[PDB]
Each structure stands twice: as C-alpha cells, then as structure tokens.
Amino acid sequence: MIQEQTMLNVADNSGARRVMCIKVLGGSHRRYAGVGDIIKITIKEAIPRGKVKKGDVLKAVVVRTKKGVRRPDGSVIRFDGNACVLLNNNSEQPIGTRIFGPVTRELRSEKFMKIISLAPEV
Amino acid sequence: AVQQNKPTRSKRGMRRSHDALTAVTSLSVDKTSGEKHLRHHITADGYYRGRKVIAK
Amino acid sequence: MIGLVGKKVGMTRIFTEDGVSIPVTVIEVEANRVTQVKDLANDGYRAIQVTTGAKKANRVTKPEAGHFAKAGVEAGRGLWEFRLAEGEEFTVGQSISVELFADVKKVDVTGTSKGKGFAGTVKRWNFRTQDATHGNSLSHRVPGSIGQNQTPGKVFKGKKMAGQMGNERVTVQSLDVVRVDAERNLLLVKGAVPGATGSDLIVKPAVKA
Amino acid sequence: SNIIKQLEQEQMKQDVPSFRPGDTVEVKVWVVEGSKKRLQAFEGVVIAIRNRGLHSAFTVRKISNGEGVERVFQTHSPVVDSISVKRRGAVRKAKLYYLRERTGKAARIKERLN
Amino acid sequence: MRHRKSGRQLNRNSSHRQAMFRNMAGSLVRHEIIKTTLPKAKELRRVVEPLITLAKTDSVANRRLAFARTRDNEIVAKLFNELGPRFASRAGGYTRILKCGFRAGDNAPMAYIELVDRSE
Amino acid sequence: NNRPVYIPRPRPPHPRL
RNA sequence: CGAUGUCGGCUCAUCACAUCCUGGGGCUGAAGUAGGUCCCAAGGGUAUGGCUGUUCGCCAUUUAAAGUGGUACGCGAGCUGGGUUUAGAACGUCGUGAGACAGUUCGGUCCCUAUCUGCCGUGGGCGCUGGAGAACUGAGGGGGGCUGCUCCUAGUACGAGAGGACCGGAGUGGACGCAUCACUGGUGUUCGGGUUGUCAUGCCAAUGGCACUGCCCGGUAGCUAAAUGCGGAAGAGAUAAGUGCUGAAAGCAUCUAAGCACGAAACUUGCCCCGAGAUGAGUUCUCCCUGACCCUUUAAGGGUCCUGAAGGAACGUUGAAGACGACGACGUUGAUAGGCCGGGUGUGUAAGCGCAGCGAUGCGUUGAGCUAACCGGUACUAAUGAACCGUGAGGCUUAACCU
RNA sequence: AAUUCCUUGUCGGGUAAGUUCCGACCUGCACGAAUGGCGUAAUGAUGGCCAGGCUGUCUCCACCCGAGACUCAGUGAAAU
RNA sequence: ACACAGGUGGUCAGGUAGAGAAUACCAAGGCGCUUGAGAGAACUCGGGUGAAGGAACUAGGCAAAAUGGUGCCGUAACUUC
RNA sequence: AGGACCGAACCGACUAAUGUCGAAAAAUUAGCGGAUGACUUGUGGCUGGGGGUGAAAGGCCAAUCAAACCGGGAGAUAGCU
C-alpha cells in the first residue's frame, strides 16, 4: 500500500537511499501501489558520488511493503519497511547492480528476471 | 421552519385520528380467587396462577 | 431449469492439493418435495411449487394443512415455486435432491440480505463526508445539497437519501459450485451468499451462461 | 454448527507439534516454480498463535539482513509440511508483538529449560 | 445495529451499571425478594444466579472470588451456608420474575424478582 | 398584552451590497 | 429597496449536445501504425498535486479521456468565510483640511425546533364485495451499461527500409457497484492480565472503589475495510449515419418510387430489484360457516334468542427484524429467552499450601485459574386455563349446460 | 518594500512542480532623512515562509463509550 | 425579571504522595444538583482506539496528536557581554 | 537587586468548539497572557451633558453615547408613507 507522498527505502545500490512516491501508474485515479506495481518517484537524498542526484524524477518498482502481500492459501508476508528499485523511464531495466534484503516471488512476471536474479533470497 | 398559513381544525383532527388509545380488553380471571387482573400479571391481592406469591 | 431451496450454514474453506484455499459457503439442501404443478391450461404458465423442512403440527394452519394433504406431502416451512424451461416435467409429491447440481458449474444464489436498519447516506450510498475541522459546524456526515434552486423547485424522484438498508432479497450470480454431497445434503459454493446463518436461500443454475 | 464442525474435522492434520509463543521454529513450506516443487525453510520466532481449529494460524518473525520479516502460516494448509522447534522461549505473554520495536541485544529471550 | 449483542445499557455508564447490579444483587440475597423494574430484574438474573452457582461448592478461593463480587461479608456468609445447600440439587433457574403492574411515579413496568424459596 | 423591554436587534448585521 | 445574502471551496447533483474518450461510418494530399476533416451517436466514463482567495492560468506527473454549456454565472432554512464589502491601524498618492482612492497590507459575531409542496423510508384505515390463509402471473417503474495493458493470430497483411495492422480468441488490471466475515486486520469502556497514587474491607495475604476505561498489554462475538467472492455481458427485435440487390419514372443510368437485404455502447428486450390502490383492484390452491322467532313506511329492510367456525388480534418469551409500527420464531403436544452441564475461544501458570533465599522474588502443586455476545445439549426459571374480534352458505340482470 | 498599477519585474535559492518566501539588480508610476532614514541583541497569545517530530487534518473512513434524538408516563412553550 | 451553568470582600483550612493553597485519593462536614422509565436508528454534541501512508486536508498544520519531571554531561549563529 | 524567570490564588480575554426562540441581553469546556507590580482589590469620597473622563477606541459616563437620562416648549415640523 504505497500512495503519493510515501517514503520508500531503496533496495538497490544506485546511490539513492530515500525516495518520495509522486504518482501511481497503471490506471486513472489509482489510489495505491501493490507488491510489484510501477510508480513514479523523486529522490530525496542520495550519495554525492552516486549516478542519481537529489530532486530527479524517475520510475520505480516496489519490492517490499509494510502492509504485505497475500498468498493464495491465506498466508501473508510482512516487512518492517517499504523498499523499491530504480528504473530508466523508457525501459524498466533496474539500474542497480545489486539489491539488498529479501524480495518476494510476486515479481515473477516473465520480466523482472533481473530483479529476482539479484535478490539474495527468493 | 415556520408555517405560512395556519392549518385548519380539519387538518388538526385528521392528524389526531391516530392518537386514539386502545383498551386492554384482555382481563383474565384468577383460577382460585376469581379476581380480574392483567394477563401475565399478579392480582392486586397478590395471587398468580392460583397460588399466592406475595404473602403480604 | 428449476432451482432448489436450502438453508445457509456458516462458512468454511477447502484446502486443495495444490495449496490454494477456496472459501466456500455451506448450504444445507435437503429433499425438496413438490406440492403443486402448474400448467398453461389452468394457470397460464408452467411452474412447480416445492416445500422443504418440517413444521410443528399445531403451528400449521388448516388452509395450509389441507393444501399439503392434497399433494400427500409432509408439511414444510414456507413454499417456493420455479418456472420450467419447457424441457422437463415433474409430478406432484416428487422429491428433488441436490444431486441435480452435480453436472452444473455456476449457480445463482438468492436470499435476504442482513438488515442494517435505518442507515445514513454515508453508509447507504457511499457519500463522502465533509471536513471534520476548518470551521465545519454540525455538518460532518450530513448529505449536503439535495436540489439546485427555484428553477427545478423540487427534489427529483429517486434521490439518494438515508433510509432502510438491507433486509431485501438480493441475488449473487455466477458462483462456482465446489462440491455436492447427496448423502449428507450439502452444497459447497465458492464465495459468499446473501443473508445470515440459518436463512433460507434459493439456488438455481446460472442464467448468464 | 455440527455440519460445519464435521466438515472441517476431516481436513485436519494430526502431525501438528505443540509449540508456544517465543519458541524458535523452522517451518518447511512448498515452493513451486512453473513445474518444479521444492522445500523452503523459514526459521524464526513465534510471536503469536491463533487457535480456531481448521482456521488456526501462527505468525513467525525472523531477522533478515537489514530488517525483520513476519510471515503468517495457516497451520492446516497443505503448503506447510513440517514444523520443528529448536528453542523454548521463557516468555509469559500470549502475543510477543513488542519484539517488533526491540532489536539487537534487546530482542533475545530466556530459555524455558523445562 | 447491535446484531447478537447482549447486555442492557439502562441509560448508565459502565461503572454505575456495575455498582447498581452489585448493590441490588446484595439486596436480593439479603431479603430473598425485591421489587424492581422489569428490565432491571431481567438483567439481574445474569449476575445473581452465577453467584449462587459459585456458592454450590465451598472453598477459600470461591469465598474470595464471591467476596470480590457484592463486596459484602454478610452476603458471602449468607451464600455457602444457606443458598448453597438449599439449591444443591437445583440445576439453575434459582430466580423467578413476576410482573406487578406499573410504577405510579413514572409508569415504569415493575416486577418482583425472588428466589425459588420461602415456602415455610 | 405588555410590550417587551430588552428589544434586541432582530435584524442580522449582514448587508448585501 | 415594509430586504431575492451576489466571488471561490466542500457535499450533492440533474439536463442539453455544438462529443473529450469508448461505438458505427464517408472523404483523404488514407501504403501500414498514427492522423486530418465531416456525418450518426448522450449508454457509461470524463485526474492528482505545487503557486495564488481566486474562477481562470502557468507548471509537474498520470489516464481511454481529464468535453463545452444550462440549472438565481445550480446548490450558505446543507457546511466554510479565504477575496470583496462596516467600525481599528499603517503605507503610497490626492486635498490647506475633515477625509478619499476597483491602490496595497495586519485584524475583524454567518440565526432558524420544518406547517405545506417535494424527496428518502416505514405504518394505520378502508376498498377490491361471504370470510380467511398461502403461492403466483405481470401492466407499470427503477438499478446496472466504463474500460487499460499483455499474449495468440503475427511479427502476418502493408512497406525500399525503418516501422507495423483489420477481424477474432485468451489472460490479467484500474475505477465503480452488490454481497459477505472463511481468511488478513481494525474496533471490542460487557473477557483475562501487568502496573502507579490513594481510600476501604480489624491487620498480613488477598480483593474492591476512584484517578479520561487511571495508564497500558492482548482479545471473544458482533459490526467493519484495507480483507474476500460476484457483476458490466452474450443473444434477439426494430433502426441512425452508411453500404446494398433488383428496379421503372426518364428505352440508358439510378439504394427507391413497388419490393428485398445488411447496418452502432443509442431505442425495445435479454440481467437484477420493486410491483394487482394495475379502483382496469387480476389468476391458482386450500380452509371455514348450510339454527330459529318476530315487526313494518314488505325493503340488497329492521329487531330478539341460541350459536360464533376457519382465522385474526391481544398478552408473554424473543430474534443475525427493528426509531416506533411492521416483519420472523416460540408459548409447555415447548429449546423462544435466561440459567445450568460439556466444549471452544481468549488471557495467560489463580488463591491456598510447601520448598529455596536475610529480602524483593523464584520453583512445585499448574498450561493452572477465570472467561462477554460463540457451539452442542438440558424444562431448572419465565412463556396460564381462558377471555376479545371475526359468523350462520353470501345481491340483481343476462348467456350456456343439467332440471 | 506594510510603498510597484503595468507585474507572477529580471536572475538565483528552496519544491517533481513556488502569483508566497529568501538573496541580488534598479525601468523608485508614486522611498527618504525627528509627521525622522538605515541597522539593531533581547522581547511578542504580532505578519509571511521552510524543516524535523507528530498525528483521523486528509486518501477513506470503521468500531466503541456516554448526553440528546426515538417510544411510554407527567408537565407544557415559541417565532409565524 | 426565574429555585438562572454568571458575579460577590475577609477569616479557619487536617491525612497520604508532592517543591507546593497545583494535582490524585481521603478525614471532619456536606451533598447526588426537583422530571422519570425504556429502547440502543440516522444525525448532532463530548470522548476512546485504529491497518498502510503521514499535511497528499486547508485561505492557513485550524483542530487534534506530540513534547512535558529530577540529576549529570553537553549546548551554535549573534550580542548592548 | 529586578516594570527578572516558571507557576496557583487573583486579574485579563489570544484560539477552537458548543451555545444563538441559549443555563447566560457575551457564558461554558479545553488550551492561553500577566501574576512584587505602570499590579490587583474592599470601603468612602470628587469630577455632570457641548460637559466629565480617556496609556486616545469617538472609547466610557447605570445592559442606552459622533453628544446620557427624566420632565417641559410639544399635538415641533414632515412638499413623505
């Protein structure tokens, strides 16, 4: 459950550490983003030596949510924070080289193969 | 919030047609003492279903 | 095709071999006995009237007792009838079991929804509440405006306002039938159905095939 | 109800070990990736147990590399295969929700040694 | 909408409601018959009759638990010594409500609640 | 029967200019 | 002018079509994707933020689109009061001055218990004709009608290449609506526990009152969303723009004059709900009543005695029904409510005693004790025998069959 | 600018986006030196702007506890 | 104007905790405020709690929430020191 | 020492809600400012209407103030309703 103005941590090592969600994509009047929905974010503070600077708008994908995800058998997965991965605004293509922390398997959409491969767990 | 014309006595009576009370018309007679009382209620002297229940 | 009358019995879930859990509503569909068969010659339309359950001997009135005795059917609670599809026929006194739902996949369940009593516009029509602060005075959940001005001069019919909510019959359609148990008279349908536990439900095959 | 209770009873499993909140537990769960089925191990601390029969469930919290992960398992679901207990926490509270705030040396609990 | 809820409010807060039943439970035990409104009498059946059930078996823990309700040593003495043995073979239903007309002051439906005793 | 005394200003101070 | 509160915002809308999207078409300087323009079409849908009091506008990022207007520039007896528009004060400017300025700043009381119409709900009365209890037909009315992306067709048709369809099928989303509590949760001042101050039960121990439930930690049932299922149709009928077949007037040609075809989210139906007060008051099934006297201004007349059935109402216990009425279950030939027994759930190892320790405290008895609304049982208490209302075969005329 | 109509002057800072705010220039319609000019620590229930924490303000409301509203008994108004 | 949630000068002023005449619970003493009984709808008023987000609300962080005591360490720009 | 600081009584009234035929012809609830002073308060005096008083608002002068109240000129006058 990520909506506008929400703080997110960064799972990758692109140099960003905290980002603000400014829009939820994928539908008109969409309220909040799910486990693996694409969102538009702005970086609020990053590494000075990183390739992404403060106050830049680029897409992102949620990988972890505090609210959690629901499994088909009724189980749920919950995390202590919300995390995302950075993107390129033209092709999804996570720019990071490695991603820290667990990643749920809900991102297996025949496309996030790069995210799951770099995921230390699942 | 306030009336523009005073309602007639006809309208007043028409509204009051539903205010009429209804008689109980359901007074039961005690089995032993034969005292009229409301159904499912003790008699004035303290009887119910024949047997005395108040003893006072 | 005809439906059946059953009683809602709580809810449960079924665990499949692949792991996914299916929430199912349990409907107790005992034998339904046909009490009257209608024909175009007399009634102008063809239908069968059925009864289910049982009633106290001293509670069924004489007009109802004679109606059941004519068909030779034991007195039950209430009466319901279903129109025929012209492709099947029935006889008075015949008993209909839940087995007819063995070959179906979607069903429509009709029942009386739970009664919420007098409900406000916010709860009834999902009206948006006004601000709770910023000067608002005694207008936190009020409906707001209900008309325009002199030019209409009236409130249009069908306006959304507070009133009775629930306690009307509603139909949930295209529900997957999960399991049918003839010997135990159970009908597991995936999803939720209107009404509370113990309420009478009408189950018929889905019409939106 | 009698009908419901009988319906749930047939779906039970009798190989559910007895565990209490605060007990370190490793739960084996089934994982499917297209056509292959594998066993995945989730080890953590039981912080809450919900007893409702067929609807009984428990939640396990583990400290991952950076942040904690809480998973709620349905006890009688086919997904869970086996439950094993390593430690026996000496807690005296039904729900250990206070462990979320705590971290580091403050998240450890004593041993029942019973 | 209070679906399936139980417990009358009686236009009182929780603390006042609890005390009022506590006193009026004690009065019923002391006198074995009292006159109250019908709604109050009905709600008392759920606080007085459990007390008699507790008094069936005499023990230190039961005595302490009984004392914590009604907060009266006279009532606790009355229980476990008379009410207990008297209802030893009685499986509930220790009370009886009898409607007795309407109160003159405000037309409250009044009723007598009295233990199934006093057959001397 | 008897005229009032307080005679407050009933009109509301809100001019529609 | 014996008073019609005049900008914005919020809530709630409704109509028009000069259509923003979706739908159907003509032409194209229409290769295809994507366009331009015009015609038909109002079923549904038709953003979130930054700046400003702003409408507007600029800017940022979304969507299929972020339509134009009417409705007292819709809506203050529905809300706000930021702008403007009282009294205070200041700046610039004008005036000798009091003061003034669609010049600018700081501050500045928004009343109303709804009689009538209207609207949303819910009842009583009578009618529908002998009465009563049920189940229906359905005139008529209302609700719903939105759509993105991915894959297959296919990398096909097209195209020098770059690029890349039409039609049809499948899957998965957003927004909206209905239902529900099995799951994940919220609430749970009626359940259990921890704990601070103080008063009290003779005192210790153990408990209760008060301090926002004293402050907190969990949590049953209900209600509930963020939770979980389902829905938008397909099909048919008659059509709009448009495309036609045959075909004369007018030897030809021509969609039209006769005749025959197709043709859209529009219209009628199909789906769901209300519905015989539909005074045009409907249909079917079942149940109950088939005793006597008199009177006259001898009438579908009135009066008296005896009988009052089906059923209803009333009263009581009540309900996942409810403002009150109403609606449902039950009233002993009884599980309707309470209690009680067992279980479940929740909280979490009661009190007492014993042991270890100088002590706080710990261990054993003990996963104990206590448990609201839940589940299955049990007449233990309360649902009294009766009274009350409701009758005694139901008009006239005509038609058809027995007599 | 408490002063500026044209005007949201121009550039920079702050925000993804700044008619507000801060800094600088001067084309000062119509600042200006005791109806005082420019600074000024401290002070202010003083005006404007930004940040952290915090939250039902809000997305979007849900449940609960009390007093009214509703029914019964008694008493019994008002504007119009 | 009322048996009116307002106003009205001085003196005495105990216990436990507390810096305290604050505050909580009490003693002496005095009171339950002159309409009640039910039900447990919308909505209004006064309060409690809340998933994920945390000013996206709004003219404006209005209102709410939050901070809150003692001792020790430590404490910037600027300054009339 | 202090028109010093925090904070009750006491004095005042910045914000919000309630209340507008209210409990009240400006109050209540929750916050808020001063609180050894240019402070606050009891009792008694003095200033009288083109006058008083005013840390100055055209404020206050018995719920009435850009000229109080009462009686009189007075049946002022009214090309107005």
* Count of helical stretches of chain B: 1
Profile the largest sheet of chain A. 5 strands, mixed, barrel
Strand order of the largest sheet of chain B: 1-2
Total number of strands of chain B:
4
SS-based structural class of chain B? Answer: alpha+beta
Radius of gyration of chain A: 14 Å
Structural commentary:
Chain E: One of its GO terms (biological process) is cytoplasmic translation. Chain E: GO terms for molecular function: structural constituent of ribosome. Chain E: Requires L15 for assembly into the 50S subunit. This is part of a larger assembly, with chains A (122 residues), B (56 residues), C (209 residues), D (114 residues), E (120 residues) and F (17 residues). By secondary structure, chain A is mostly beta strands. Chain A has a single domain, classed as Ribosomal Protein L14, CATH 2.40.150. Helices cover 5% and strands 33% of the residues of chain A. With 56 residues, chain B is α+β, with helices and mostly antiparallel strands. Chain B has one domain (1-56). In chain B, strand 3 (47-48) and strand 4 form a beta hairpin. Chain D is mainly β and 114 residues long. Chain D has one domain (1-114). Chain E is of the alpha+beta class and 120 residues long. Chain E has a single domain (13-115), classed as Ribosomal protein L17 (50s Ribosomal Protein L17, Chain: A, Alpha-Beta Complex), CATH 3.90.1030. Chain E is 46% helix and 17% strand. Chain E is built from five helices and three strands, in the order H-E-H-H-H-H-E-E. Chain E has a three-stranded antiparallel sheet. In chain E, a hairpin with a 6-residue loop joins strand 2 (95-102) and strand 3 (109-115). The longest helix of chain E is centred in the N-terminal third of the chain and has 18 residues, at 14-31. The interface between A and D is medium-sized, with 18 and 18 residues. Chain C binds four RNA strands through strand 1, strand 2, strand 3, helix 2 and strand 5.
Put the structure in a nutshell:
Chain A is built from 1 helix and 7 strands, in the order E-E-E-E-E-E-E-H.
Furnish the topology, listing elements before pairings.
The structure is cut from a larger assembly and holds chains A (122 residues), B (56 residues), C (209 residues), D (114 residues), E (120 residues) and F (17 residues).
Chain A: E1 7-10, E2 16-24, E3 38-46, E4 57-64, E5 69-70, E6 76-79, E7 83-86, H1 113-118
Parallel strand pairs in A: 1-7
Antiparallel strand pairs in A: 1-2, 2-3, 3-4, 4-7, 5-6
Chain C: E1 4-15, E2 21-28, E3 32-38, H1 40-43, E4 47-52, H2 62-71, E5 77-83, E6 95-96, E7 106-112, E8 117-119, H3 121-125, E9 163-165, E10 169-181, E11 186-190, E12 200-205
Antiparallel strand pairs in C: 1-2, 1-12, 2-11, 3-4, 3-6, 4-5, 7-10, 7-12, 8-9, 10-11
Chain E: H1 14-31, E1 33-37, H2 38-55, H3 60-68, H4 73-78, H5 83-86, E2 95-102, E3 109-115
Helix pairs in contact in E: 1-2
Chain C binds 4 RNA strands through strand 1, strand 2, strand 3, helix 2 and strand 5.
